[PDB]
Structure formats: C-alpha cells, structure tokens
Amino acid sequence: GVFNYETETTSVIPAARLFKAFILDLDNLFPKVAPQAISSVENIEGNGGPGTIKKISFPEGFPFKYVKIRVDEVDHTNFKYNYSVIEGGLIGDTLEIISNEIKIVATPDGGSILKISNKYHTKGDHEVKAEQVKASKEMGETLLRAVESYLLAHSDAYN
Numbered sequence: 592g593v594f595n596y597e598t599e600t601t602s603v604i605p606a607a608r609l610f611k612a613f614i615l616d617l618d619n620l621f622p623k624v625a626p627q628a629i630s631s632v633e634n635i636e637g638n639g640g641p642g643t644i645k646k647i648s649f650p651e652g653f654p655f656k657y658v659k660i661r662v663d664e665v666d667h668t669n670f671k672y673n674y675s676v677i678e679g680g681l682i683g684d685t686l687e688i689i690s691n692e693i694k695i696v697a698t699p700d701g702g703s704i705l706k707i708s709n710k711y712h713t714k715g716d717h718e719v720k721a722e723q724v725k726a727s728k729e730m731g732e733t734l735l736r737a738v739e740s741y742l743l744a745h746s747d748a749y750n
Contacts, residue, residue, distance in 0.1 A: 592718075593710055593712050594710070594713065594719050595709070596708075596709045597706070597708050598705075599704055600732060601698065601702060601705075602702055603700070603701075603739070604702065604739050604743075605702065605703065606695045606696060607670070608742065608749055609670075609695050609738075610667075610670040610695050611749040612742055614672045616749070618634065618639060619632075620738055620741065621734060621738075624741045626650065628734060629649065630648045630651075631647075631648045632645065633646040633648075637662070640662065641663055642662065645660045645662065645674075646659050654680070655680045658678065659679055660675065660677070661674060661675045661677050669694065671692065671693065671694045671695075672692070672693045675690040676690075684714070688712050689711050690710045690712070691708060692708045693705060693707050705735060
C-alpha cells in the first residue's frame, strides 16, 4: 500500500535564502551543523541535481547505519526537492521505496514554511510504524533548526 504523511514547519529565514542552504548546500551543511543527526553525506554519482544517487550516514547508534537516496527534481524556481529512499533501513524488507517532496513557500511575514511529504510504499501487508513517522518528523525539525541557527549566526552566508 501507499501511505502519505505531511508536515509543515515554519522558519524566519526568507524562502529564497532557505532553499539555497537547506536544499542546495545540504551535503556540506547537514553533517556540519547537525552531527548528532548526520555523520556524512556522499554523492555516489552526480552534481547533487536530478539523477544523483546519494549516501547519507547516521551517527553511531542510530537504528540504521545509512540510507541511499535518488534525487528526482531540484526545482530552483518553486523551491522544491523531490527524492526517493531506495536503499537501507527497512527498504527491501518491509518497504519498497519512500518518496519525499520538500517545498519552501514564502510567508506574509517575510519568513517561510517547509512543506514535507513522505510517501511510504510498503511491501505486501506490512504497515508503516508510527515510530518511523515520528523519527522522520523529528529529524526534519532538528536539521531545520540547526540550519536556521547557522544562517542567523553567519549573516553574509548564502545571499
């Protein structure tokens, strides 16, 4: 079956600046600012753009050592990133693929909102565990705070 979860979290960073840091520089930024969430990021092939296969490793004592991601879309106009988790974790056992889309929309504040979508395609009768959804939500929030905070402490960065 295919099961959709959606969150939204707000940021005081302008959408255009957030997209640059959060999405376009995530390979460098993430293991830098959130080493408690992410210990490295390696591009197995590609730029970082559509077609890229990427390896994300997790710190010592996470449930899984690493996931592998396929980047499908990096829309610089509408501030969007589409990627699918194709290897690691429960992928190939309980899950077929997890496809994700992140979008950054400007708010009437001058800040922004991250809209996250996570589509789990399960194998057979296996059902998504609430703990997987919560850990994904939590991970998104730690990465987002850690980036926003870095941006506020380095005001000339990504303008």
